[PDB]
Amino acid sequence: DLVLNEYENQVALEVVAPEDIPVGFNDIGGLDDIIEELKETIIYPLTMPHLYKHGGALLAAPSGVLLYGPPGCGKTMLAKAVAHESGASFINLHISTLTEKWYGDSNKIVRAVFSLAKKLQPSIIFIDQIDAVLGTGMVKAEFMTLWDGLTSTNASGVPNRIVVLGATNRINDIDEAILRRMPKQFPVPLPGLEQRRRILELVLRGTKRDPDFDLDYIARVTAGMSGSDIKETCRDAAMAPMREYIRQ
Amino acid sequence: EKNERTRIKAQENLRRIRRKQIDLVLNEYENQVALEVVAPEDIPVGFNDIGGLDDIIEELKETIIYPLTMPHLYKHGGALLAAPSGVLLYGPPGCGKTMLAKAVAHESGASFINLHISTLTEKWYGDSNKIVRAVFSLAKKLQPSIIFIDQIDAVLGTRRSGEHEASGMVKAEFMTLWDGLTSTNASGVPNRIVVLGATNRINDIDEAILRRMPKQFPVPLPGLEQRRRILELVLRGTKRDPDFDLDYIARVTAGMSGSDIKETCRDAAMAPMREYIRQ
Amino acid sequence: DYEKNERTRIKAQENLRRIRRKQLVLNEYENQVALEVVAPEDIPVGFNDIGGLDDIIEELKETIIYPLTMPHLYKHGGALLAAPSGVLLYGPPGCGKTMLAKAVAHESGASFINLHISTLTEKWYGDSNKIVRAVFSLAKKLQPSIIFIDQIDAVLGTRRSGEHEASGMVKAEFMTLWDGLTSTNASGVPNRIVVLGATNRINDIDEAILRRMPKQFPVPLPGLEQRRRILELVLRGTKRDPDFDLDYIARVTAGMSGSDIKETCRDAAMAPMREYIRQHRASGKPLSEINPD
Amino acid sequence: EKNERTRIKAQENLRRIRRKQIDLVLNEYENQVALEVVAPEDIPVGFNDIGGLDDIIEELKETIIYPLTMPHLYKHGGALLAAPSGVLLYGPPGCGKTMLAKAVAHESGASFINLHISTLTEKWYGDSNKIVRAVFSLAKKLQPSIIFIDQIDAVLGTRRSGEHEASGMVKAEFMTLWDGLTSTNASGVPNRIVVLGATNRINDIDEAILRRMPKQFPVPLPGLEQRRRILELVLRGTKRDPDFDLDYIARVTAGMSGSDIKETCRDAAMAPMREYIRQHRASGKPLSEINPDDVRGI
Amino acid sequence: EKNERTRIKAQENLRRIRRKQIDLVLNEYENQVALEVVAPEDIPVGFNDIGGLDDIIEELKETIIYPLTMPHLYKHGGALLAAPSGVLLYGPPGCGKTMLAKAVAHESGASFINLHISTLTEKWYGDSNKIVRAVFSLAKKLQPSIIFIDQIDAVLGTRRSGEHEASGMVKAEFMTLWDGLTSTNASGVPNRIVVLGATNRINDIDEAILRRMPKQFPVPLPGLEQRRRILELVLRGTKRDPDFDLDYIARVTAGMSGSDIKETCRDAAMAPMREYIRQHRA
Amino acid sequence: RTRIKAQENLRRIRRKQIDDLVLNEYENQVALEVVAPEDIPVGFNDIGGLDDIIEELKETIIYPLTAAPSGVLLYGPPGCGKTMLAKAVAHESGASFINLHISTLTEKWYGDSNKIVRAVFSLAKKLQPSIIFIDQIDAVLGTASGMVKAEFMTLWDGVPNRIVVLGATNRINDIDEAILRRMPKQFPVPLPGLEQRRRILELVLRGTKRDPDFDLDYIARVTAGMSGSDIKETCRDAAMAPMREYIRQHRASGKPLSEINP
Numbered sequence A: 001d002l003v004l005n006e007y008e009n010q011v012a013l014e015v016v017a018p019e020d021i022p023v024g025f026n027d028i029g030g031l032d033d034i035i036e037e038l039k040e041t042i043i044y045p046l047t048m049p050h051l052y053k054h055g056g057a058l059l060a061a062p063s064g065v066l067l068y069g070p071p072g073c074g075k076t077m078l079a080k081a082v083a084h085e086s087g088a089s090f091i092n093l094h095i096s097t098l099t100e101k102w103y104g105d106s107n108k109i110v111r112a113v114f115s116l117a118k119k120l121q122p123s124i125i126f127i128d129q130i131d132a133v134l135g136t137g138m139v140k141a142e143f144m145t146l147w148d149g150l151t152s153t154n155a156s157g158v159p160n161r162i163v164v165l166g167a168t169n170r171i172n173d174i175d176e177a178i179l180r181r182m183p184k185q186f187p188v189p190l191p192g193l194e195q196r197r198r199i200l201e202l203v204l205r206g207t208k209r210d211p212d213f214d215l216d217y218i219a220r221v222t223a224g225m226s227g228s229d230i231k232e233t234c235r236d237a238a239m240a241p242m243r244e245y246i247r248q
Numbered sequence B: 001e002k003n004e005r006t007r008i009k010a011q012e013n014l015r016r017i018r019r020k021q022i023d024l025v026l027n028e029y030e031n032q033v034a035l036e037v038v039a040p041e042d043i044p045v046g047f048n049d050i051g052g053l054d055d056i057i058e059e060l061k062e063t064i065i066y067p068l069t070m071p072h073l074y075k076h077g078g079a080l081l082a083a084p085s086g087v088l089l090y091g092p093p094g095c096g097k098t099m100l101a102k103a104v105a106h107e108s109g110a111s112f113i114n115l116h117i118s119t120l121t122e123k124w125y126g127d128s129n130k131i132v133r134a135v136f137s138l139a140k141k142l143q144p145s146i147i148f149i150d151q152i153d154a155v156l157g158t159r160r161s162g163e164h165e166a167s168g169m170v171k172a173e174f175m176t177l178w179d180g181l182t183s184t185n186a187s188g189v190p191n192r193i194v195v196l197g198a199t200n201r202i203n204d205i206d207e208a209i210l211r212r213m214p215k216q217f218p219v220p221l222p223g224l225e226q227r228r229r230i231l232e233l234v235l236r237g238t239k240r241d242p243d244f245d246l247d248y249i250a251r252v253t254a255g256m257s258g259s260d261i262k263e264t265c266r267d268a269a270m271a272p273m274r275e276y277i278r279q
Numbered sequence C: 001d002y003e004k005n006e007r008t009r010i011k012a013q014e015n016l017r018r019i020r021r022k023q024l025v026l027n028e029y030e031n032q033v034a035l036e037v038v039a040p041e042d043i044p045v046g047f048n049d050i051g052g053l054d055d056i057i058e059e060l061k062e063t064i065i066y067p068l069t070m071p072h073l074y075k076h077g078g079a080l081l082a083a084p085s086g087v088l089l090y091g092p093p094g095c096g097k098t099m100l101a102k103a104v105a106h107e108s109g110a111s112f113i114n115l116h117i118s119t120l121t122e123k124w125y126g127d128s129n130k131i132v133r134a135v136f137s138l139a140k141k142l143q144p145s146i147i148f149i150d151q152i153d154a155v156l157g158t159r160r161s162g163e164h165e166a167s168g169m170v171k172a173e174f175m176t177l178w179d180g181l182t183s184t185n186a187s188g189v190p191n192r193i194v195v196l197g198a199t200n201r202i203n204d205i206d207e208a209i210l211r212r213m214p215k216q217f218p219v220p221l222p223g224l225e226q227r228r229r230i231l232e233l234v235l236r237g238t239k240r241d242p243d244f245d246l247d248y249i250a251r252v253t254a255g256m257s258g259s260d261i262k263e264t265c266r267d268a269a270m271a272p273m274r275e276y277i278r279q280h281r282a283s284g285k286p287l288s289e290i291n292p293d
Numbered sequence D: 001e002k003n004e005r006t007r008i009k010a011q012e013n014l015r016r017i018r019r020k021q022i023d024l025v026l027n028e029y030e031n032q033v034a035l036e037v038v039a040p041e042d043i044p045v046g047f048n049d050i051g052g053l054d055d056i057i058e059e060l061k062e063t064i065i066y067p068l069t070m071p072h073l074y075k076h077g078g079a080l081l082a083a084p085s086g087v088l089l090y091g092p093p094g095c096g097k098t099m100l101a102k103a104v105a106h107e108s109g110a111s112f113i114n115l116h117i118s119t120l121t122e123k124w125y126g127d128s129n130k131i132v133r134a135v136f137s138l139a140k141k142l143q144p145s146i147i148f149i150d151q152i153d154a155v156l157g158t159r160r161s162g163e164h165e166a167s168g169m170v171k172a173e174f175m176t177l178w179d180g181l182t183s184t185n186a187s188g189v190p191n192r193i194v195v196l197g198a199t200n201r202i203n204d205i206d207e208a209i210l211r212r213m214p215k216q217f218p219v220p221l222p223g224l225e226q227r228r229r230i231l232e233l234v235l236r237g238t239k240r241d242p243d244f245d246l247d248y249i250a251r252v253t254a255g256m257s258g259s260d261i262k263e264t265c266r267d268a269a270m271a272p273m274r275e276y277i278r279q280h281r282a283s284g285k286p287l288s289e290i291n292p293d294d295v296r297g298i
Numbered sequence E: 001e002k003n004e005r006t007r008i009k010a011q012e013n014l015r016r017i018r019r020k021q022i023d024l025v026l027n028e029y030e031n032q033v034a035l036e037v038v039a040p041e042d043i044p045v046g047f048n049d050i051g052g053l054d055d056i057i058e059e060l061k062e063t064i065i066y067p068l069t070m071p072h073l074y075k076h077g078g079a080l081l082a083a084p085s086g087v088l089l090y091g092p093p094g095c096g097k098t099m100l101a102k103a104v105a106h107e108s109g110a111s112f113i114n115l116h117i118s119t120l121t122e123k124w125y126g127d128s129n130k131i132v133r134a135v136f137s138l139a140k141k142l143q144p145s146i147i148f149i150d151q152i153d154a155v156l157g158t159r160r161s162g163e164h165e166a167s168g169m170v171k172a173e174f175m176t177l178w179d180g181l182t183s184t185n186a187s188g189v190p191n192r193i194v195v196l197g198a199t200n201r202i203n204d205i206d207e208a209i210l211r212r213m214p215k216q217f218p219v220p221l222p223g224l225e226q227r228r229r230i231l232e233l234v235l236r237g238t239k240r241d242p243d244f245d246l247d248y249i250a251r252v253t254a255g256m257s258g259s260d261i262k263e264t265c266r267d268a269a270m271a272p273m274r275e276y277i278r279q280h281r282a
Numbered sequence F: 001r002t003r004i005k006a007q008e009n010l011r012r013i014r015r016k017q018i019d020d021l022v023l024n025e026y027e028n029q030v031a032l033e034v035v036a037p038e039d040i041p042v043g044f045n046d047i048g049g050l051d052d053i054i055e056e057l058k059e060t061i062i063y064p065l066t067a068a069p070s071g072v073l074l075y076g077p078p079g080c081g082k083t084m085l086a087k088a089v090a091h092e093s094g095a096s097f098i099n100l101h102i103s104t105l106t107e108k109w110y111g112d113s114n115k116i117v118r119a120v121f122s123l124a125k126k127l128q129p130s131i132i133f134i135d136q137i138d139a140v141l142g143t144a145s146g147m148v149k150a151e152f153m154t155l156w157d158g159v160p161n162r163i164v165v166l167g168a169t170n171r172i173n174d175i176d177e178a179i180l181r182r183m184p185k186q187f188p189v190p191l192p193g194l195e196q197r198r199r200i201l202e203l204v205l206r207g208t209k210r211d212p213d214f215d216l217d218y219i220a221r222v223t224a225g226m227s228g229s230d231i232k233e234t235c236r237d238a239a240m241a242p243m244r245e246y247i248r249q250h251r252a253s254g255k256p257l258s259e260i261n262p
């Protein structure tokens, strides 16, 4: 919905609009201090800075949020929520898109993604499964150049008010030169015995649960699985009383 | 095709009109590296804004900048007192090796240009070498020419036998333009152009480029005095509570490289701000 | 697609006129290399600005640069007594490899041309090979000529059995149009062309190209003796103390190449200028010291 | 465009007038390839100038030049006793290969042609395939003709999936014209055209093309006899016999190629000239006489 | 551009007349794709001189080359029982597939056209495609016909991103005029055209063109029974000297290509001709 | 040019009459391609047992042309019935089905490469309804060529005139991402299923007698892998078996005169 340089556009297809996102904060599972710190520091000053611009040149938003934990949707719901809550175009990266066909295609794509994130909207960049930047090669040094360099600060002295979330299952092998520029790092433990109660309450909104017992033992039934199979078991025990109801 | 060329020419012409006076012709390739000429009044951080490190602020000025800009003082020595043909800033990530580049581009008028790694890598066979040539030719036509390459250990590197061809002959044209046959002038003038580059590890940049960058300034972690300077410098416009003292934060901060200091200080600046939301 | 043609042709014509007046009809592609002929007046350094390479300079001059200029003196063994196909200046980086090229292009007398490796590689298919033949055609027209390709190891190389196509052809074109079916003449004169190249990585150029340039001069680091003359060559203009032991400087380094010595001399000469500028004196002044460190 | 093509056509017409002597009609494509017809008076190295390898010369002559040129003696044989499709001269770099093609151009008198690989690859699209068809449309208009492609490892070679798509056609147009549908005549003559290809990397030469050139002559480095013969041949023009002992130099040179023996002869042949110049530099101006002497090389 | 145009038109008129006679006016633009119309008599090889290959040589003669030539005896069927449009002839190099193409052009009966790769690739923009239209329109003007693209792996090929879009347009033009919207007639005849192919490798020709030509006959390496006949069928005029045990060379060759078996035979055939070196002696 | 305009007049008259207006010569060349309705042999029933995608066609694209969206892309892999579906559409459309023949677009002149596309759009708008079917649109509309590509979708957005364009590319995710979303509907043409393969077999085996081989029910059990064209090729190879055997038996003697027995 703006002027096109074409190379970056090979990225505009991934630019999710800030509206019509399924975020709906009440639906997310039990996560209090994580959402608290995000809504206080990453998205609160990311918009309406006039309630926040009392101190200039230092109250920008921290350009990097690292979400590390077990494999699951815990590192996805908050990321999708940040964009819809900040009036933010969720410009996903789609890491496999950075694969090399031309000699400098990945380099130009990494340039265009930051160019669009600076020009299009200050919303966020999302790098899921961060392993392209390990720490052991052109694109790796291309990130840290465009991230915080000569063109990062504007004439007013404030940064480009852009955030780049960090999604990865691994830690402490993430190219520490890049880990340095992801200030706010959040350990998100997907397995939760109390958050699972809230997530099951969210799931059972439309599901009929008259005969089955009150939602207590569900908080310990799949105690082993953290967040994924619980999302898959939403229909496991759901249709179980539903086969006989559909046939007759 | 032609429309894109004319549009890039309009960009370069406007950029030269805005940069020259605080217009010259160009070919197809330096017409693209001409979009990297950084205006000095754009980066709002100079030598007065970097803290802790002062000798590097001292060595970058009299040994490099003054020999480059207004060298008429350095005319007593004809060819030997010219400016150092290259500079490199190496150290652990977190210090201000890229922040020094901002100060050099802001508080030293030298026709600063920074070529990104994307400007060098090109799809078509041979365009990368021509881009390097265009860079070193614009650096001559426009020649205080403090060229910058951030993370120079990536576009350059210790070449192996099985290195990619397109990256193995752009390291060669780069060197051939840097101190090649046509480097000096007719009267012996060394053609003042400094290639300032940052890097986290001077271990695989090259064995023939490290000789080219003699002024290699290591940027170590700030000490007990440098941390105090950085704290007193980054809290200029922030709230000043009468109770806390900076020496406590500086003494407790053992490591915490300058970027880490800035981060842990920005995080501390949320104590009074969050309380206003409780209304 | 024509104005660039006119610009390149006028530049090539002016450059060739300059080289000719120092003492003619080119096609579309010979103009691309015609604007790279380096004139002797342009290069300021001669052979007298190289220290310690007096032994290598003799074998690089009397054997390849003066069977090639005035070959009338070498008329008895006209077949054998010709300029070799090329010199390979190989060695660790920072010692005379490009200084010797400068000296040859200045005080050679031959139609020197700097190749500017970007000129070899063109985006269009079948264009690098056209330039590779145009450069040798221009060298034959500029006979005698001394082609120079700094850092041979980039454009050339062991040809990587599965690798790029155009770069494989542009590298297989030197092999064809430099000692090929039409290198010699009707009498035996091999075109009086020498392709001199300076690379800091020997045994990576080619197995079939190291047979082409037979004269390969190793350029090592200076020793205890010729550093004493490299220091003298570098410190030729700076007014000095009546006594500073250059024996100490030449004997203490012991492991630094030519550029590493030039940098030390630069710092030692920058010391007094900085010490004088520290006195907040705006205008120039012709007096200072040279005291060693 | 016409102003340049007219001069081109005039130049190739002059070249063909010089070559054909003891007025063809040419289109634009195989016209510019007429600049490469190498006259026999332009290569002063016959088969009496290469020594050592003789079976390669013998088999080369009596299996190509006698079949290719002078076919009337091979007429009654049929289709078998005819010139082979092509020839591959392979081996280490710097021994005999390019110097065998020189003798075939000077000695065969069979309308030799030097391909000049760059002329194949044209910048425009579908202009390299036209030149590939043109080199065979001109090889047969002045048959017999020997098509020489020096260093057949880049323009040809193992076809891959990730080709340029512009060299894959020149790599396929060539083999479609050189052993294709309309090569043989109405009677069954295979065009009397030979493609001699010299290279040093045989295992990357488009193996489907290796079926085209059957006569593959290995050109190895010289031995105890070939080294001495190359020494005798390269040192012809030199007053070298005060106490010359070439039997010793032939054994000293262990395994260097034929061209390295030549460079050694060069370095050992101009040493006395350097000595004479250094002795005469004391006084006078160089007016060198015929009195140096060759004694011992390195 | 007209005098050379007149030369092209005159030469193509002569060629088309000599092919047809063993009347039609062109548009001067398909006037150069008709220059590859191979004559019937200028191909010295036929079907009776192909030893070894017998299943392929019969499948061509029965199911491809002869639903087309003399098709009136297939009128009992409808859309089926027609000549299948497309042949591949894939196999290793030098095993005798261009020889099969020669034999088909010599003893087929349809107007064989030896369409090269250059005649399809034109320098000007949007002109190579119209040359494709000219090729298929010429095949449709007289429609007993067998188009032949030798080595179909470069002019065709698996299309990638970019890769000279004006070239992928040519493949799209091929497979659009192949069986597009105007392939059949009002009755249902499949245009009466068959395109013969040839290629050392079928792995990247296409996924669409790979099925455009249904019959993909593999020509393998000659075995014992095939080499034992090729080695005897290559020796037509060579005077067989006495005591020549043919069975020895047939087995000692040990699975050699179809052309290398020709070279090994030419060597022995020219051995005595070269031994006739007495004339030099005298 | 006069011959071109004359042939165009004849073809457009034979199309329209089943009232003609002469127009510009540069707009006169594309009008040499107005295919007649009785020229195509195939009908809807000739297509196999798909009868769902063809249902969507007959329910949405042909009703407004008797509004209809602009842009109908075919999706199936090679050999599934894309060109067959487009042929049935051209035969029973009722509009004036005008193809392209992509070479008609690409002219080797500066001011003709887009004049021809403007001519195509002007002819489609002059007589209504119409269809601008482009065989394998992944070639003329890809990722002067730029002028044509831009010229196309600029004239794309032009009662909304009742023009509908239909593309029949055989490849997805490599085709005209700009104009891809601009055309609303895209119809995936999958491979034949059980009932689908049964319909293909029962429709192809129409002229030949009912005993070419064992039976048709058994043959439609192993055709799950092959596409819609390979099944036709296997069917025709099977049909050639009786004719092959009869001709081989007749080769012994007599003149090969046609007979009505396998």
Ligand SMILES: Nc1ncnc2c1ncn2[C@@H]1O[C@H](COP(=O)(O)OP(=O)(O)OP(=O)(O)O)[C@@H](O)[C@H]1O
Pocket (backbone or CB within 6 Å): A144, A148, A149, A177, A178, B049, B050, B051, B052, B053, B091, B092, B093, B094, B095, B096, B097, B098, B099, B100, B198, B199, B200, B230, B233, B234, B257, B258, B259, B260, B262
């Ligand atoms: N000495 C200092 N004084 C003031 N601020 C500093 C200092 N050192 C670091 N900083 C702060 O930390 C950040 C330094 O980022 P910089 O561009 O130097 O990273 P970098 O050195 O390029 O990282 P890398 O070495 O991994 O490339 C800046 O935002 C700056 O405000």
Ligand SMILES: Nc1ncnc2c1ncn2[C@@H]1O[C@H](COP(=O)(O)OP(=O)(O)OP(=O)(O)O)[C@@H](O)[C@H]1O
Pocket (backbone or CB within 6 Å): B175, B179, B208, C049, C050, C051, C052, C053, C092, C093, C094, C095, C096, C097, C098, C099, C100, C198, C199, C200, C230, C233, C234, C257, C258, C259, C262
């Ligand atoms: N023998 C010498 N005498 C005088 N100066 C020297 C000598 N060797 C090196 N230098 C100095 O080094 C610089 C030139 O370096 P040079 O071009 O020889 O390096 P190089 O061998 O080309 O390295 P590379 O091949 O990696 O480019 C000059 O500024 C010159 O003053």
Ligand SMILES: Nc1ncnc2c1ncn2[C@@H]1O[C@H](COP(=O)(O)OP(=O)(O)OP(=O)(O)O)[C@@H](O)[C@H]1O
Pocket (backbone or CB within 6 Å): C175, C179, C208, D049, D050, D051, D052, D053, D092, D093, D094, D095, D096, D097, D098, D099, D100, D198, D199, D200, D230, D233, D234, D258, D259, D260, D262
């Ligand atoms: N048999 C020989 N007799 C005399 N001189 C020879 C012989 N073989 C090689 N030479 C010498 O070698 C040089 C030519 O080498 P040649 O052309 O054979 O190498 P090449 O095969 O072209 O190598 P490449 O193809 O790898 O470049 C000449 O200078 C010639 O004097």
Ligand SMILES: Nc1ncnc2c1ncn2[C@@H]1O[C@H](COP(=O)(O)OP(=O)(O)OP(=O)(O)O)[C@@H](O)[C@H]1O
Pocket (backbone or CB within 6 Å): D179, D208, D211, E049, E050, E051, E052, E053, E091, E092, E093, E094, E095, E096, E097, E098, E099, E100, E198, E199, E200, E230, E233, E234, E258, E259, E262
């Ligand atoms: N059945 C055969 N009878 C006689 N000669 C054969 C036969 N098969 C192959 N040959 C020989 O093979 C040679 C070339 O065969 P052909 O041209 O048909 O293969 P090809 O099409 O060139 O293969 P490719 O093009 O894949 O390399 C001919 O000279 C011919 O003598």
Ligand SMILES: Nc1ncnc2c1ncn2[C@@H]1O[C@H](COP(=O)(O)OP(=O)(O)OP(=O)(O)O)[C@@H](O)[C@H]1O
Pocket (backbone or CB within 6 Å): E175, E179, E208, F046, F047, F048, F049, F050, F076, F077, F078, F079, F080, F081, F082, F083, F084, F085, F136, F168, F169, F170, F200, F203, F228, F229, F232
């Ligand atoms: N459902 C079906 N019913 C009847 N015939 C079918 C069916 N599907 C495919 N066919 C057969 O497929 C053949 C036509 O193939 P088609 O034209 O659909 O390929 P295409 O997809 O257009 O090719 P491309 O993928 O290259 O565009 C016809 O002979 C037709 O009989």
Ligand SMILES: [Mg+2]
Pocket (backbone or CB within 6 Å): A144, A145, A148, A149, B097, B098, B150, B198
């Ligand atoms: Mg940095």
Ligand SMILES: [Mg+2]
Pocket (backbone or CB within 6 Å): B179, B180, C097, C098, C150, C198
């Ligand atoms: Mg150098």
Ligand SMILES: [Mg+2]
Pocket (backbone or CB within 6 Å): C175, C180, D097, D098, D150, D151, D198
């Ligand atoms: Mg050679």
Ligand SMILES: [Mg+2]
Pocket (backbone or CB within 6 Å): D179, D180, E097, E098, E099
């Ligand atoms: Mg063949």
Ligand SMILES: [Mg+2]
Pocket (backbone or CB within 6 Å): E179, E180, F082, F083, F168
């Ligand atoms: Mg189709």
